[PDB]
Structures are given as structure tokens and as C-alpha cells.
Design a protein around this ligand. Structure first.
Ligand SMILES: COc1cc([C@](O)(CCN(C)C)[C@@H](c2cc3cc(Br)ccc3nc2OC)c2cccc(OC)c2F)cc(OC)n1
Ligand SMILES: COc1cc([C@](O)(CCN(C)C)[C@@H](c2cc3cc(Br)ccc3nc2OC)c2cccc(OC)c2F)cc(OC)n1
Ligand SMILES: COc1cc([C@](O)(CCN(C)C)[C@@H](c2cc3cc(Br)ccc3nc2OC)c2cccc(OC)c2F)cc(OC)n1
Ligand SMILES: COc1cc([C@](O)(CCN(C)C)[C@@H](c2cc3cc(Br)ccc3nc2OC)c2cccc(OC)c2F)cc(OC)n1
Ligand SMILES: COc1cc([C@](O)(CCN(C)C)[C@@H](c2cc3cc(Br)ccc3nc2OC)c2cccc(OC)c2F)cc(OC)n1
Ligand SMILES: COc1cc([C@](O)(CCN(C)C)[C@@H](c2cc3cc(Br)ccc3nc2OC)c2cccc(OC)c2F)cc(OC)n1
Ligand SMILES: COc1cc([C@](O)(CCN(C)C)[C@@H](c2cc3cc(Br)ccc3nc2OC)c2cccc(OC)c2F)cc(OC)n1
Lengths: 220, 81, 81, 81, 81, 81, 81, 81, 81, 81
């Protein structure tokens, strides 16, 4: 029968660590850096770009438009590279879940575990806090408590929306398994189709909220 | 005995998925109602209207799929016994 | 005592499809509202107005079908039993 | 005993038809609102405004009929038993 | 005790008429809000707005009437007894 | 013995009048909003707008009054004993 | 015997006041949005706008007051016993 | 026994405060939307608009405060005991 | 026996915070809609629009905080005991 | 015994999360409906519209996550036990 997301684990420094999540996030990272080397070797300028270059440049200028609309690029240029990895590292991190492995499968996405999204969201938090302190050291003072929550609810909602939006898939891939295999394919098909849309939209909103939260941090 | 907690887990998990579907479904309506109308006002604005649409959906659907996560914590992994 | 979790599964599954049909019925209503308005405005935009329509409806139906799948999990495969 | 399941179907089956009607009754209202205004703005549009209108009402009425069926399945089949 | 079924019919039948009244009540308002506006904008069109109005009210009142039928099946028949 | 039926009658009647006042209050509000907006735009229109207004308030108030009659039927005159 | 009927009276009275306050609090909020909007667009209209307004609120408040009376009847008079 | 009446009264007070909260919140939101819109469109209007705004808020808020009062009368001074 | 009063207080807190969040969230949404529309229509208004906005959000939030206070007054310092 | 409080925390917490998802998923939509429309009319305004947007969403999301905190407190840390 169905069970919640348990893990295989190993102890590396007194603390136990999940064997997958760390495996599938490494599989995502190596493919990302493999595309980075392959593009950097293939890179064009006077000649016509190939598929990987016209893809990654479309993402970099989409991020450039967003960051330069939000803040002057003279002030905060580093939020662009930080934003495109947050898009593409997360994008691949969801896409690999489309290929069939199950029989219980280890190959759940990196965001189907809360630790991954907590590390990313907490990193984004300390980064934008360092951005705020770097510029010097809301829109109404009397809202301090909400502006108090904002600093918790930004990383907590970032992590929780990324977790929930992907953890549901990690459950539904098991749910349709309970139906007869000779009829289970069609709902499995539809859901696999929708998986890409939610994975992409989720990577998109996390990157955009990262930019827009950074914009709000480094104000004045 | 356990069966009263397990009945409470099914009723209480059911509420989390009921309020989820109402909030998301209506949200992606009131947001989509502003997209379609936009693409009816300037039939060539669609391209950019996806940038604020998928932002609003990403905020709305979050309130549903965070509910769905916690519903699995209610239904399969009941924090109380 | 199986009947107590049985009744809990039925009330939970009932709530899941109550919230599902409200989210679906009102989301498609508010989306088709904008569809009819935009087709009354620019009758030639109909062919285009379906692509922002069948997205929202599409999205909305996700939050109905997922409730219909979880209703089947509560009712035909009750998790704790 | 078994009665505790019986009412569990009558209550849960009621909930399925409660959220069903709030889904249809509001949906057909908010879709119907956009047809009456359209026709109120140009009477010659009543010919073409039925093409989007009955689509939406189609989707909407599905979300009802499915709950209707499921109510019968609750009241005349009592699955969890 | 068998009287729990009766209580399940009264509570459950109560939901089938609670959801129906929210279906008709608002569904007819959101629909009439258009007719009162169409007759404000264009008085001589009052003759033709009654077709879109009685289609949309006809669909919305069907959700109430059907519900009222099943509520009578719940309370005067009690299928599961 | 009577008490579970008596509690079920009171809770069932409570649901019927809860849903009744929601259907009534919001439908009258949304109909009255178009009435006030028509009288805002056109002072000469008031006599024509009252027709559409009282048609829609009729269709609304019927649904509240029928709920009030069924709550009275549940609470004073329980059909199941 | 009697205390469980006392419960049904308190919960049923609570439902009646919950639905009354939702129907009324939103009703006035919607009918009032037309008054505020009309007086923004036309300061000169404030004299006429109070007649259609106070009709609508009246009808709305009737749904609150009738529910307030039936809650008092449930909790103080307790009909079934 | 009295504790069952205690739970009934507590759930009754919860329902009364819950429906009160929904009413007051959404009514203030909708009436406030028209106030913010009137002050956007007509920069001088804020003086006149506070009469329609505090009339409509005055009604809405009443439907809250009344539920608050009645809630205390339910929990501190349980009418049935 | 306290456990019944405990469950009553827990479901009462559940209702109070469910209603307060529906009210506050939708009130803040509907007030925020007018604020963004005002800033997108008259950008020169952006200084003044915070005034009406934080009046209306002030009223909408008050409805939350009170509830949040009283839910703690049910859950940690239960009135009935 | 304790299992009645346990179930009381799951149903109480389930309500908190249902109301949080309805309030927030709709708010984030009703606010977003502004944003999209703004960008559909004056794309040049996109950069400024995110300022009043994330103020309103900043309020709305807080009403979700405060509800998530109180549901978590109810279910993991049942205060009265
Ligand atoms: C007592 O049960 C009914 C049901 C129904 C309907 O469900 C409509 C309900 N609404 C009006 C609230 C209806 C229906 C189902 C649909 C299903 C999909 Br999927 C798509 C479009 C649909 N459109 C529909 O009609 C608009 C329907 C169903 C079955 C047989 C039917 O033939 C008699 C039939 F008409 C009507 C009815 O009238 C007495 N009684
Ligand atoms: C008896 O249960 C149904 C269900 C359904 C649907 O769920 C839609 C319900 N709405 C119309 C009220 C439907 C569906 C699922 C989706 C899922 C994702 Br993820 C994205 C888009 C989706 N779009 C969909 O259609 C718009 C669907 C589902 C399964 C098989 C299907 O093939 C028969 C099928 F059509 C229709 C139906 O008709 C009687 N009965
Ligand atoms: C029993 O208590 C009622 C009920 C009803 C109705 O069910 C509607 C309730 N609404 C007004 C709130 C009504 C009805 C059913 C419909 C069915 C479809 Br399918 C389509 C349109 C329909 N339209 C309808 O009315 C516009 C109806 C029903 C039966 C016999 C009837 O004739 C004696 C009759 F009128 C009216 C009423 O009047 C005081 N009392
Ligand atoms: C019994 O408690 C009431 C009820 C009622 C009403 O139900 C209205 C309730 N709403 C305003 C909250 C009312 C009514 C019934 C309708 C029936 C249909 Br079929 C169509 C339109 C209807 N419109 C109505 O009002 C315009 C009504 C009822 C009975 C006798 C009546 O005459 C003595 C009478 F007026 C009023 C009341 O006092 C204010 N107390
Ligand atoms: C005791 O608790 C209240 C109640 C009330 C009211 O119920 C209004 C409730 N809403 C504003 C929250 C009030 C009322 C009843 C109505 C009845 C119909 Br039939 C039509 C219009 C009505 N309009 C009303 O107010 C505009 C009312 C109550 C009793 C006697 C009355 O004198 C006849 C009376 F007017 C007011 C209040 O203090 C402000 N405290
Ligand atoms: C855990 O309890 C909270 C509460 C709150 C607020 O209620 C905001 C709630 N929504 C925005 C999510 C906040 C608040 C209370 C109000 C009271 C009135 Br009467 C009028 C306007 C009010 N506006 C407010 O902010 C919009 C608040 C509350 C208490 C003390 C406070 O100290 C001053 C305080 F600021 C925030 C929070 O973050 C964890 N936790
Ligand atoms: C104790 O919990 C509260 C309550 C309240 C209010 O109930 C407002 C509730 N809303 C904001 C959700 C408030 C109130 C009652 C009303 C009564 C009628 Br009949 C008509 C208009 C009314 N309007 C009101 O506010 C404009 C109120 C209450 C008591 C004394 C008061 O002082 C005279 C008082 F102002 C405010 C509050 O602030 C900490 N705490």
C-alpha cells in the first residue's frame, strides 16, 4: 500500500544524510554543468548560435529584463547569475521525474524532500539580507509585524510552495500505480504531461520571487 | 481506540483538500478572467501577458499544493496517536 | 471497528468532491465569462481567445481531477484500515 | 454498527450534492451574466455568443453531473462496506 | 441504533437544500444583475434579454429543483434504511 | 429513542436556514447593486429598472422562503420517526 | 436524554447566525459598493441613490433579522424535545 | 451531562464568530474597494465618500459586533444548561 | 470529562481561524485590487491611495486580530471548563 | 480518553487550513486580476505595479502562513491535553 516519502540514508559527520535527494540533486547538478561546459565549448558570436546557446541566452536576457526593470544593473549585477541557476538547476531537478523507473522508485525529484528547498530558500534569504546590508548596513512603519513576518514568510513560503507544488507529484506517481496496469496508462499519461508545466511554472516563479525579493531588500 | 483518530484524519484531511480546490480553482478563474479579457482587448498582447499570469497562478496554486502536502501528513502520517 | 473509519472515509470523500465541484464550477464559470465577453468584443479573436481559455480551464481542471483521484483513494483504497 | 456507515453515506452524499449545486448554480450565473450583457450590447451577437456560452455551461454542468453520479454511488452503492 | 440514519437523512438532506439555496440565490442574482443592467443601458432591448435571462435562470433553477427532489428522496424515502 | 433525531432535525434545519440567508442576502445584494447603478447612470430609468429588479428578487426570495418552509417542516414536524 | 438536544439547539442556532452574518455582511458590502461608486461618479446623485439603496439593504437585513429570530427560537424555545 | 453542552456551546460560538468574521471582512473589502476607486478617479471626493463608506461599514460592522456579543452570551452564559 | 470540552475548544478555534482567514484574505485581496487598479490608472494618485487602502485593510485586519485573540482564548484559557 | 482530543486537533486544524487556502488562493487571484489587466493596458506600468501587488500579497500570504502555524500548533502540539 501507499506510504509517505521515506529515505535510504548514510551518516557523514554525526548527522544522518539522505542517500537520494543528494543523488538526484547531484544528477541534476552534473547535467547543468555538463551543458555549461558543452555550451562554453560550442559558443558562437559572429556565426549563428545552436540550440543550447539560443536557449540559455533567451533565459539570461529574460532574467536581465527582470533584474534591470527591478533595480539598476550597476547596483546588483550578481542577482542575474544567481537567478538563472535558480531557474535551470530547479528546472532539470523536476524534469528527470518524467522518465519511468517505478516498480517504489528512488528517482523522485530533488524538491520532493523538504531539506533541498530549505537549503535553496535559506541561501536566497541570507543572500538578499547581505544585499540589504551591503547597500548601507517597508512602505508604512506601523506594519512592522507583517514586515516582521515577511522575513520569515519569504523563505518559508519559497520553500513550502516549491515543496508542496512538487511533493504532490511525488505522491500522485504512486497513486495511479494502484489502478490495473492495462488501463492505468492514460491518467498516468495526462499527469506526466502536466508535470512539465508545473515544474517549469514553479522554477519560473521561484526565480522571479528571488529577483523581486532582492529588489525589495536592496531598496534605498 | 485508533479508529476515532483515523476517522478524524479522513474528515480533517478531506477539509484540507476541499478548501484547497475552492481557493485554487476560483483563483485560476479570477486570474484567467483577466488574461482572456486582455487577449481580447489587444489580440497581440498574449506574449507578455504570460509573465504576470504565471506569476499570479504560481502564488494561487501554492495555497492548494501546500494544502495537498499537509493532507498527506494528515492522511498517511498522522502526527497524533 | 471498521465502520467508524468507513464513515470517516465517506464524509472525507464527500468533502473532497464538494470542494472540487465548487472550485471547478466557479472557475470555469468565471473563465467562460471572460471568453464570452471577449468573443462579443472582437468576434474575429475567437480562434485566438481559446488559447488563453483552454489554459485556465486546463489549469482549473487539474485542481478538480486531483480531488477526483484523492476521492478514489479515500473511498476505494481507504489508507488506514 | 452498520447504521453508522449508512448515515456516513447520507451525510457524505449530501455534501457531494451541496458543493455540486453551488458549483453549477453560481457557474451558470457567472457565465450567463456574460451572455445577457453581450446580447444587451448587440442583439445580432446572440447567434454567435451561444458558441462560447454553451461551451462553458458544458464544462460547468459536467462538474455537476459527476457529483450527481457520485451521490447515487454514495446512496445506492455505499462503497466502503 | 437505527435512528442515527434518520438523523443522517435530516443533516444530509439539510446540506442538499443549503447548497441549493446558495445555487439559486446567487446564481439568479449574478444573472439578474445583468438584466437590470441591460435594461438600464438599452430600454427597448427588454424584449430580447428575456431569452438569455430565462436560459441562464432556467439552468440555475434546475440545480435547485433537482436538489429539492433529492432532499425529498432523502427525508421522506431514506434510501439506505 | 428520539434525541438523536431531535438533534439531527435542529442541525438539518440550521443548515437549511444558514444556506437560505446566504442565497437570499447575496442575491438581493448583487441584484440591488445593478438597480442602484442603473439609477446612478440614468435618473429617468427607475420605473423600468424596478421590473427586472423585482423579477430577480422574486426568483431569489422564492429560494429563501422555500428553505424557510423546509426548515419549519424539519424542526416542527420531522418526517422520519 | 435532554443534553444532546441542547447541543443540537446550540449548533443549529450557531449555523443560522453564521449564514445570516455571511449573507448580510456581504450583502450590504455589495449593495454599498454601488452607493460609494455612484456618489464618486456623481456627487449630485446622492439624494436619489438612497431610495434604491435602502430598499436593497432592507431586503438584505430582513434575511439577517429572520435568521436572528430563528436562532433565538432554536436556543431559547428549543421546539423538538 | 454538562460537558456535551459545553462542547455544543463552544462549537456554536466558533460558528457565530466564523460567519461574523467572513461577513465583516469581505464586506469591508468590497465597500473599501469602491472607496479606493472613487479616490483614484475623483481626487477631491474623499470628503463626500466617507458618508457612503461609513454608512455601509456601519451596517457591516454591526453584523459583526452583534455576532461577537451573541458569541459571549453563548460561551460565558450558556442559555441552555 | 474534559476531553469532550477539549475537542469542542479545538474545533471552535478551528472554525474561528478558518472564518478569520477567509475574511481577512479576501478583504485584503479585494482592497488590494482597487489599490493596484488605481495606481495603474492614475499613477499620480499613488501617494493618496494608501490612505483609503490602510483604512479598509485596517477594518479587514481588525476582524482577523480579534478572532485570533479569541481563538487563543478558546484554546489556551478555555472559557467553559 | 485522549483520542477524542486527537481527532479534535485534526478536524480543528483541517478547518484552519481549509479557510487559509480559500482566503489566500482567492485573494492572490483577486489581486492578480488587477496586475494582469494593468499590464494588458499599459505595459510600461509593469515595473511599478509589482510594488502595490506584493504589498497586498504580503498581507494575504501572511494570513495563509499564520493559519499554517496555528494548524501546525494544533496538530503537533495539542495545547490542552
Ligand atoms: C435529475 O438529474 C438531472 C440532470 C440534469 C443535467 O445533469 C443538468 C443539470 N443542470 C441543469 C444543473 C443534464 C446534463 C448533464 C450533462 C453532463 C455533461 Br458530462 C455535460 C453536459 C451536461 N448537460 C446537461 O444538461 C445541461 C442531464 C443529465 C442526465 C440526463 C439528462 O437528460 C434528461 C440531462 F439533461 C438535468 C435534469 O433535468 C431534470 N435532471
Ligand atoms: C468521471 O470523471 C470525469 C472526469 C472528467 C475530467 O476530469 C474533467 C471534469 N470537468 C469537465 C468537470 C476530464 C479532464 C481531466 C483533466 C486532468 C488534468 Br491533470 C488536466 C486537464 C483535464 N481535463 C479534463 O477534461 C476537461 C477527464 C478525466 C479523466 C478521463 C477523461 O476522459 C473521459 C476526462 F475527460 C470528465 C468527465 O466526463 C464525464 N468525467
Ligand atoms: C416546491 O416549491 C416550489 C418549487 C418551485 C420550483 O421548483 C423553482 C424554485 N425556485 C423558484 C426557487 C419550480 C421550478 C422548477 C424548474 C425545474 C426546471 Br428542470 C427548470 C426550471 C424550473 N423553474 C421553476 O420555477 C421557475 C417548480 C417546480 C415544480 C412545480 C412547479 O409548479 C407548481 C414549479 F413552479 C417554485 C415554487 O414557487 C413558489 N415553489
Ligand atoms: C415568515 O417570516 C417572514 C418571511 C418573509 C418573506 O418570506 C421574505 C423573506 N426575506 C425578505 C428575508 C416574505 C416573502 C415571501 C415570498 C415568497 C415567494 Br414564492 C416569492 C417572493 C416572496 N417575497 C417575500 O418578501 C418580499 C413573506 C413570507 C410570508 C408572508 C408574507 O406576507 C405577510 C411575506 F411577505 C418576510 C417576513 O417579514 C419581513 N417574515
Ligand atoms: C438586537 O440586535 C440588533 C439588531 C439590529 C437589526 O436587526 C439590524 C441587524 N444588522 C444591522 C446587523 C435591526 C433591523 C431589523 C430589520 C428587520 C427587517 Br424585517 C427589515 C429591516 C431591518 N433593519 C434593521 O436595521 C437596519 C433591528 C432589530 C430589532 C428591532 C429593530 O427595530 C424594528 C431593528 F431595526 C440592529 C441592532 O443595532 C444596530 N441590534
Ligand atoms: C500571531 O499574531 C499575529 C498577528 C499579526 C497581525 O494581526 C497581522 C495579521 N495579518 C496581517 C496576517 C498584526 C496586526 C494586528 C492588527 C490589529 C488591529 Br485591532 C488592527 C490592525 C492590525 N493589523 C495588523 O497587521 C496588519 C498584529 C497582531 C498582533 C499584535 C501586533 O502588534 C502591533 C500586530 F501588529 C501578524 C502576525 O505575524 C506573525 N502575527
Ligand atoms: C472587543 O473587540 C473589538 C471590537 C471592535 C468593534 O466591534 C469593531 C469590529 N470590526 C472591526 C470587526 C467596534 C465596533 C462596534 C460597532 C457596533 C455597532 Br452596533 C455598529 C458599529 C460598530 N463599529 C465598530 O467599529 C467601528 C467596537 C466594539 C466595542 C466597543 C467599541 O468602542 C466604542 C468599538 F468601536 C473593535 C475592537 O478594536 C480593538 N475590538
Amino acid at each position: 500500500q501507499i506510504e509517505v516519502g521515506e529515505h535510504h540514508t548514510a551518516t557523514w559527520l554525526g548527522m544522518t544524510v539522505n542517500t537520494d535527494t543528494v543523488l538526484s540533486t547531484a544528477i541534476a547538478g552534473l547535467i547543468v554543468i555538463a551543458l555549461a561546459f558543452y555550451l562554453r565549448a560550442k559558443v558562437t558570436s559572429t556565426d549563428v548560435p545552436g540550440g543550447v546557446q539560443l536557449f540559455f541566452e533567451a533565459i539570461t536576457i529574460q532574467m536581465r529584463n527582470q533584474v534591470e526593470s527591478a533595480i539598476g544593473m550597476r547596483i546588483a549585477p550578481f542577482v542575474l547569475p544567481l537567478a538563472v541557476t535558480i531557474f535551470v538547476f530547479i528546472l532539470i531537478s523536476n524534469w528527470l521525474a518524467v522518465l519511468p523507473v517505478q516498480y517504489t522508485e528512488l528517482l523522485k525529484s530533488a524538491a520532493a524532500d523538504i531539506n533541498y528547498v530549505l537549503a535553496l530558500a535559506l541561501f536566497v534569504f541570507v543572500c538578499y539580507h547581505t544585499a540589504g546590508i551591503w547597500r548601507r548596513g517597508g512602505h508604512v512603519t506601523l506594519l512592522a509585524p507583517i514586515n516582521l513576518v515577511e522575513e520569515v514568510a519569504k523563505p518559508i513560503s519559497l520553500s513550502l510552495r516549491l515543496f508542496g507544488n512538487i511533493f504532490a507529484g511525488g505522491i500522485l506517481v504512486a497513486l495511479i500505480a494502484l489502478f490495473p496496469p492495462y488501463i492505468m496508462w492514460a491518467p498516468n499519461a495526462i499527469w506526466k504531461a502536466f508535470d512539465l508545466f508545473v515544474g517549469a511554472i514553479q522554477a519560473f516563479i521561484f526565480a522571479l520571487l528571488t529577483i523581486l525579493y532582492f529588489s525589495q531588500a536592496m531598496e534605498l | 481506540m485508533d479508529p476515532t483518530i483515523a476517522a478524524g484524519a479522513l474528515i480533517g484531511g478531506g477539509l484540507i483538500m476541499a478548501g484547497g480546490a475552492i481557493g485554487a480553482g476560483i483563483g485560476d478563474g479570477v486570474a484567467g478572467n483577466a488574461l482572456i479579457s486582455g487577449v481580447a482587448r489587444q489580440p497581440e498582447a498574449q506574449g507578455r501577458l504570460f509573465t504576470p499570469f504565471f506569476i499570479t497562478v504560481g502564488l494561487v496554486e501554492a495555497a492548494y499544493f501546500i494544502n495537498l502536502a499537509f493532507m498527506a501528513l494528515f492522511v498517511f502520517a498522522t502526527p497524533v496517536k
